[PDB]
Amino acid sequence: ISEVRGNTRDHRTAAHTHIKGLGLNSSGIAEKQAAGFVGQCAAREACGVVVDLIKAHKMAGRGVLLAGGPGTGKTALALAISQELGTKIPFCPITGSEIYSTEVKKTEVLMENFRRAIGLRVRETKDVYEGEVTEMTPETLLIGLKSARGQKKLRLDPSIYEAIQKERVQVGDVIYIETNTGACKRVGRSDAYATEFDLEAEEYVPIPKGEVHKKKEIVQDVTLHDLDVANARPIISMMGQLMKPKMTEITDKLRMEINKVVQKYINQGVAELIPGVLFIDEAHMLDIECFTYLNKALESPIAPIVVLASNRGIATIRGADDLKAAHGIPPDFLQRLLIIPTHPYEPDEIRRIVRIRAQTEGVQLTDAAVDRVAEHGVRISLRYCLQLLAPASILARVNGRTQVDVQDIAEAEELFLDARRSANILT
Amino acid sequence: HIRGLGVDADTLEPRPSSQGLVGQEKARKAAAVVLEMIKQGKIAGRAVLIAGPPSTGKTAIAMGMAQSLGQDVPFTTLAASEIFSLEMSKTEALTQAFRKSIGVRIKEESEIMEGEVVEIQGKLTIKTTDMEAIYDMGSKMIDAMTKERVMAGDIISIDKSSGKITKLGRSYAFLQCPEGELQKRKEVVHTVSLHEIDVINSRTQGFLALFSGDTGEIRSEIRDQINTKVAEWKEEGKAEIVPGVLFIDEVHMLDIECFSYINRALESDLAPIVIMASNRGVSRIRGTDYKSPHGLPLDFLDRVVIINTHPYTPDELRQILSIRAQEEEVDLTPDALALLTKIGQEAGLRYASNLITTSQLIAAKRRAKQVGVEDVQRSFKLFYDPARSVRFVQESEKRLIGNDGVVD
Amino acid sequence: HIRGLGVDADTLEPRPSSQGLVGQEKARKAAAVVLEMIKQGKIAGRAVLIAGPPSTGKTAIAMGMAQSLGQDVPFTTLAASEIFSLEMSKTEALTQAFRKSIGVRIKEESEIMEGEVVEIQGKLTIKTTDMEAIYDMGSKMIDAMTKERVMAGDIISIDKSSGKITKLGRSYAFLQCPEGELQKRKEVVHTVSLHEIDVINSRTQGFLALFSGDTGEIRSEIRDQINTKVAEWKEEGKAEIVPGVLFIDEVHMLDIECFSYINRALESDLAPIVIMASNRGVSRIRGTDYKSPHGLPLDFLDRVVIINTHPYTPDELRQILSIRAQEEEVDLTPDALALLTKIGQEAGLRYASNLITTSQLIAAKRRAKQVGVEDVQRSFKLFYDPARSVRFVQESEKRLIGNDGVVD
């Protein structure tokens, strides 16, 4: 579990790195401009209440729905819900279109995302005693350990004395003993007393490196999916390795081996598992079979916070014989969650956002350029205008400038056109 | 929470609020007639249909149908959507549902913990007039009696074989403390459903089942061992087969292949009471090209017995929200409940019930022991009902009506 | 043929006709910004979208994107239709496409044939300032240098390990003849794509593969051996992973399951530059019931970076057809090219390019060294463009308009 390192899809949250959380005071009322947020007071305060409902454990089989248009702070508020829940919490942003896979089933892909939303907080402090054995009999046992770069003799507690007698010991055996109720023995194992005659033996163990007394500090924050993806290999290259269509490395029997060891760490009290947040954009795209999986998922106490988002008003239920419902959510699951409405930003609110994103991205710009780009944030979507910051900075650097002006941003619209305008131009 | 049907024994005229049930006299009186129709043998192999507006205690009326049949008759809730699962055939999904409804009565020797409680994952101590003992609480046992709402001083009977805690009463505000030692093995009747016998005899579900692996699909080999043992027990006189009640919700969602199985399972002499529940006026049949009233095939509507629930009055809604307020341990001002019931008039009862838990947290941040009108008005303005949320999206999507008053 | 992007290094202002590219300044300047956006790390895991009218050098601009990134970066063309094959899963069809784009750089010892050529299935003789030798031409080698347009007297470098012929220059119309013996083994960098390593290590495709048998479906066992060896080479420092550029054409044809895989393959840190190309204004999504602009899902349009190509002017079209005329070794009169470009105004560039090869044969039958206007006017009247051919069928099918001028 120490070797297991967390691999996170940072490209999804890359557009929200400018947001630090949810800007609100002690009473609960949202601030005008805090934590990288502009406006959206009604929706900010609303989910600022749901974070408390999770903390108070009052979200008994409940979820959240973010109703609003494109670029209305939906995905942004979802990340704020995680950021406000605790430190190093799992946030899994998905889109209904991601479920629509070619090889894996509609929920074999929804399963790993649920595993990507449930984490594990580890806080294990162990006192290592590695090396050989040099027995002495006092009034309750003295053993001298020999390591690769050190030698130390220690007067063991009578608790260890009972544990060592159970697992046969002799002078010249490599051992791993722990003060925190730990007993492990390697009978006769020692590379020092190994002859070159026998090779197939493997009955000997090398002399442990460093010192005998070692203070092992384990502070690990990994999701359940990280445990599955690390135990699948028969690991640095794996962050860029996926070129295989089948993806048969993750099998149901491999997950059972993870579920049992995770349970063992909870029973010991070493590490407790912490459920996070599962965000589903394009919630209407989800099949009826997916919603019934979610209904079963929400009933489990281990389950994370299922936050959905739908840009549609009235939509046909996917997986049903054409049944129009609100946001495309079936009634069975619509009642299961509380709806939070996300309001569109007026031109005055849009330029306040631009200045925050430019400051984070590292793009210097004139006051007049912010006004021109905000005009595109109201005529077209908020995502399109925000995308104009990076090409205009290159166009300015090329012209020798650091400050981006109207002339530089005018070319950005000419070169990089939105999906709506690009279609109409072709006629 | 639900005590029974809440009806008169002789006249069969239902009380406005009795036996854990509130309102819906017309439906509850019709429910009482159906029970009597089966008992006399007048209705044989006929399904029930609770039609009506959403959140009109449709589950509660069917829960009342159960308790009014026998002392320990099995009752199971099944939503039609839950049948269409990614892993588990809709045949197995329906077989599990029917087996969850049919139970067996066997007299067994098992120890029952009887005595007064002195309350504190945790540790709850018990006491009798002769002996005193401390008991470490099991993770599943905590969740079992919190649903029962067991408080300190209550006299309870815990059957260790089933795990069910039964509230016998209280010593002080009454029933007196039991004499002898706590654990006593007696010949008690055990009623365990066919599906539960399958899940007991089959492979134990490992921790985090929804994390990965196949569903609760019971092997045909295991089910065979149970069926043959139950059949051997029927002949011996050891077991008594008791047909419970299956409650099917969202019935409009059922396929034509489901109704053919329901009638095939209903064909049996030991079939359960199949209660259907439709929240729709007019809905098309799935699998069939044709349309029908509640989404039932042309053949089912004539066989079924239809009962209709009605919309709750502000006075009927008044206590429902207050009962749910006490259950969720919240304290409201008379003005706040009046406002919460006023929400329940235009918007659903379920939406108004959601505003109860949300307003408590806003009142907790204000540091008040009374949840008021300004606390409820907040939840309504923060969290939107389905009809208002869709309205909000529709206007944001396309401005249907302009400032001039001109459309398009 | 294509030399590069044809843009200025400092100002990034594109020249009208430079580096094997003609016109489309707006798109080429936008292409140059995208390349700089990736280099600075500003754009991370973002696809490109070359939208515009058909035959507007969409492949050529993306070909320019490649050569302007690195010296030997892999570039592969994929039409969305080619994915839907009768034999080969559309997953394998897309995996092959992505593996064709990712390459590995290894410094290898291999012999390179350097020297002047004296030209003649055939036999081409080579010469150096010290030695002379005759070499029998291989069937695949003939097809390799004819695409390079290698003429007699040219100074060339043939790497025997890869088989690629590289034109270093010429001795007479300049670079002088190499000193020593032809074959010299040097430490040269080899850039072979992941898919090519799979096809090299896997079973060799027999003569006439399209005649019968399974497609180039590489076994999961073989691909595993390559992936593990590449991973072992990355750690050793032997290989350097270089992410090339994947060009996807007819994007409107892609299913919802394709876009989910594209984003999954794009998720990687070593992912290639995915360039999409749509020739449509408004087109519905396949697999999804909803409609969209270029046929991309509601989630892809916001992530993608759109670039637009424009219709070529008669002066822009003037040289394109003349470049293609020289490539196909045809000689036209100034009046004929003016007529051929006039065809390219109302009808497509591709249709006008087809009229070049057809007019040559009619001019060959007339026994003339100059292809004229009457030679081009023939091809236009013999062979019809899509819009004219459909017009021809529609009138023959049903006479939509009568002699009177009355419809129906």
Ligand SMILES: Nc1ncnc2c1ncn2[C@@H]1O[C@H](COP(=O)(O)OP(=O)(O)OP(=O)(O)O)[C@@H](O)[C@H]1O
């Ligand atoms: N209130 C806000 N304050 C600061 N930035 C905001 C605010 N609202 C939206 N944004 C920013 O707008 C940019 C693009 O919008 P984004 O893709 O997040 O839309 P969304 O509404 O959050 O989700 P969806 O994709 O469902 O519309 C993001 O960088 C986001 O953080």
